[PDB]
Amino acid sequence: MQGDPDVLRLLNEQLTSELTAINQYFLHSKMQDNWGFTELAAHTRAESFDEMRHAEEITDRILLLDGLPNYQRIGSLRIGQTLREQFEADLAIEYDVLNRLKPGIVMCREKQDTTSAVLLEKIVADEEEHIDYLETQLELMDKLGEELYSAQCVSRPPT
Amino acid sequence: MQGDPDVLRLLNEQLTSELTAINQYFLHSKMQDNWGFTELAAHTRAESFDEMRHAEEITDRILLLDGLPNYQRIGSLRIGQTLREQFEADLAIEYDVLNRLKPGIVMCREKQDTTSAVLLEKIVADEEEHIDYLETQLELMDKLGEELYSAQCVSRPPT
Amino acid sequence: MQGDPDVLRLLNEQLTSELTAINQYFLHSKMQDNWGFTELAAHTRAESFDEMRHAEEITDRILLLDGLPNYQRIGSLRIGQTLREQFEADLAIEYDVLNRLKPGIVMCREKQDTTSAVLLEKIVADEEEHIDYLETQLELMDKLGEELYSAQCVSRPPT
Amino acid sequence: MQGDPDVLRLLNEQLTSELTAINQYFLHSKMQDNWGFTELAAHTRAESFDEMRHAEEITDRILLLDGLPNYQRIGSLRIGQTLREQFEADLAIEYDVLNRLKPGIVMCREKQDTTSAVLLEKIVADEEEHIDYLETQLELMDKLGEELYSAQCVSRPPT
Amino acid sequence: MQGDPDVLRLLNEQLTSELTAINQYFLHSKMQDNWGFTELAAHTRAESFDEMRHAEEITDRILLLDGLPNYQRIGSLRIGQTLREQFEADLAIEYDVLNRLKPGIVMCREKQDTTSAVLLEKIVADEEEHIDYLETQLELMDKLGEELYSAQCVSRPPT
Amino acid sequence: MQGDPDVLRLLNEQLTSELTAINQYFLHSKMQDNWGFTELAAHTRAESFDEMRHAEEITDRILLLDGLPNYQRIGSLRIGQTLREQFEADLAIEYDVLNRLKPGIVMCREKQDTTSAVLLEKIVADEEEHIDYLETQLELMDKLGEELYSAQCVSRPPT
Amino acid sequence: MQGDPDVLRLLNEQLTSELTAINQYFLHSKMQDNWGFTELAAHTRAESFDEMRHAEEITDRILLLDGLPNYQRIGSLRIGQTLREQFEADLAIEYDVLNRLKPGIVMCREKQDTTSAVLLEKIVADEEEHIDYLETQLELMDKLGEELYSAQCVSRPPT
Numbered sequence A, B, C, D, E, F, G: 001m002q003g004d005p006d007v008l009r010l011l012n013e014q015l016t017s018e019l020t021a022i023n024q025y026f027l028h029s030k031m032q033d034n035w036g037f038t039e040l041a042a043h044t045r046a047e048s049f050d051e052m053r054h055a056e057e058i059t060d061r062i063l064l065l066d067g068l069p070n071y072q073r074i075g076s077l078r079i080g081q082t083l084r085e086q087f088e089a090d091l092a093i094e095y096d097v098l099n100r101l102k103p104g105i106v107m108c109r110e111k112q113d114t115t116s117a118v119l120l121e122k123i124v125a126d127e128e129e130h131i132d133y134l135e136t137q138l139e140l141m142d143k144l145g146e147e148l149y150s151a152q153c154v155s156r157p158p159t
Ligand code: HEM
Pocket: B019, B022, B023, B026, B049, B050, B052, B053, B055, B056
């Protein structure tokens, strides 16, 4: 049984987004750890691994639909040079997901592929929470001031 | 609390298809077990028990909607005389499910019955997986050869 | 502390090779799994995860040398459409690694970066074993024959 | 305490055979493992270690009889390039053992050295079983076909 | 067994450096503890004990090479009066180590003393990580501000 | 994958030395045990088993390199008639290993085969240590006096 | 809180002696261990670690007194070439401690610094005991005879 060509292309575009985010988040976590923000880095690393899960799920869906998962293509990394830049770069990816997926889900259901729809609805919900988390860190950076904020991202003592 | 008569009719149609699948899968597994393919048989038998669970969830839904679950009607069994035929026979039932539930779900949602819809979406998801497994079994029969595939279905020694 | 720029170029090239390998091995694993070769897929999946460890190790080193780990660039995937093509495709990557690392190690040592050299020596040893595994599988295919080899790669019963 | 000179010679010849067998079987196990026949390899390896135990028992007896255990001399290895060859090679050693030890035991008892007699009687009993196993393996190859037989020697999946 | 005279000299110089580092780091840990930066103190102290382990490993190698471990000689301590100074002082030792050991290792290998080479390669790897940590600490001080940074070094409450 | 002819020859010469050592050490332990030096014999025996491990490692590396491990050829055994002679005879083998492997390693690295080099470097480190142990035993005999030294080799009471 | 200049100088002279002792004793244990006197070496080593403890205590008392602990200066090492010489060399250090600390304590108490006096009194009690031990070892050598005494220092068998 073959999936709908547009649904499949939508899934591959999402796949590319996940692969991009895996790399971007993973690199950020390494950088964060390298700067001594070890506590922050553990969180960002986990976000990276969650993206790997999404990526695998999508790959599973594509193969079931008899498509070809695209592992060759990658989007453009935005690698931040400060904590703030990193949060904002990560926000950018997440917002791009929502813009793609919101109308994509509607399309999936019009094409009577609810299983694909449901998988993307799951992703939307996960990205909304991450977007919320990030936007809250940026808020706290302003409420706290950048130094005091950063201090909450190191262990005691710093390592 | 009375359900939409069309939604109700759809649910009863799906229940008929579950009860048919239960009998078909169960019998196929007894045959497989009776032929010597005991390892395969256990798998088929479990598939039968999952159909039972689906049938019961459908029954619950119908009763909740004040409908009358149809336990009288059974569709036409396709009993396979070879492992290949049995896989093809089970495969044909699942495709009927998809063919019915795809527009079924869209309809449920238009009639503003999301709970019934979510039940059918769950079923579509499981059926797709089972279709994939069965289609994959048939491909494996071609790659391995009939005899070779069949030998992976018996225990050691054969019981 | 600043790393030798050629050493850093070498590490980044190898990084790209690891990332290419992660994707290629992961996809091959999902394809093998989707064909029914569930026993083989588990192994291949594990080979993919070692590549991820390697990539992190190289990343750590690059960061320590105050370099810029490249997560943007990816090599050409070689995707196989049979078990044989897959083994050959994965072999081609590994062989590339050796050819790059054999001179690289000598070079790292001429440049007095032994930590980087030892890292790459470790990689070489691993790749040598993976190559030996792959090449042995290809041999087995011939000794046992395609089908019979394939049968050793499915569970009982097949899943 | 001094041993009879012919008994000591008989014992030292048997030792050479053990030492020969140790090396032959161990290399075979290595080559079988290297080939992917890892299940067979473990058995062959175990056979090598039993040979080591024989060799040590013979050494003990020689030392007790105030003789000189010969660890310098070795027989000619027959290294097989196929599973069948390896079995026939191993068989050939085991037969030489019977041919030597049968008259040897009668001799030991004639010379009233029953302890050496009993040691040699145990080795004969052990070699007969090993020979029988090798013969069965050669037979199974004929009954199952070589490829099919080989497949019973790999693990699932082939490691 | 006699060691090469230059290798032995290289080894004894490294020993002096270890002995120097042991004392410097230990005093620093004591002064950090004494200042109330008790969380930092424990890490620094641990660093001192790793130095002790290095020193013992070097001594073992010298003794094995029939040389004379020099425990009389010591380098000039650089005792810091601020946390920043202490970090810079400690850094200065670690850099001298790299500067000595880099050419030293090539020399050991030229003289075909690989065991001494490997020991020195391990120390380099360890020193690079320590240097990186010190650099990160210096950086964190800049990013967090000195007071804020210091506060990440006291316990709650300050003991 | 095919190994360099000089590296393979180097590895095989070393394998010959390991096999030779295994025999010499094992027989020495048996003699020591038969003289009543049961405590010393246990250590000598364990040394033999370590040689067995090295021989397996070399064998594996040869097989990976697609060479033929030589199990046919054994070096000349020096079998000591006193503890001192045994000690000295074992020293002579070990010093031959160092003699070969020192330029051997350098050549391995010139030929860009680091995995092989690293195996031999490990072997050299172990041998340097066994030489230390043996030379110290010989020193102890001179210090304590042979009778007294021998007494430390027996159990209480002697067995 | 500021300590008396003579008390501080007293404490620092003693610290210098502890640091000197640590080195002399540790190196002696390493030599003893390398001569095969492994049992004796363990005790000598533990003595070194006890000196380390005294040095930390003195360091703490100095810091509390607001002085500068001297970790730059080490006394003259007497490194014995035989057990007897090592024993005698260690005695000489210990007797110097008593020589200093005896009037040292009295002066401490005249200056109304009992905490410091009590630390030194503890040190003296420990040293008197280590002197007893060492003098008894030297007596034992005369009684048993050096060879025999040495034999009690090795394990069975010697390692
Ligand atoms: C037709 C409507 C049926 C319904 C709604 C139903 C429901 C269930 C359910 C919920 C279970 C529990 C196990 C599981 O769900 O996996 C079960 C077990 C079982 N089913 Fe059915 N079933 C039906 C008919 C049948 C038929 C036609 C057979 C033919 C053999 C059958 C044979 C069995 C057996 C032997 C068990 C195990 C009993 C036990 O474990 O004590 N059932 N059934």
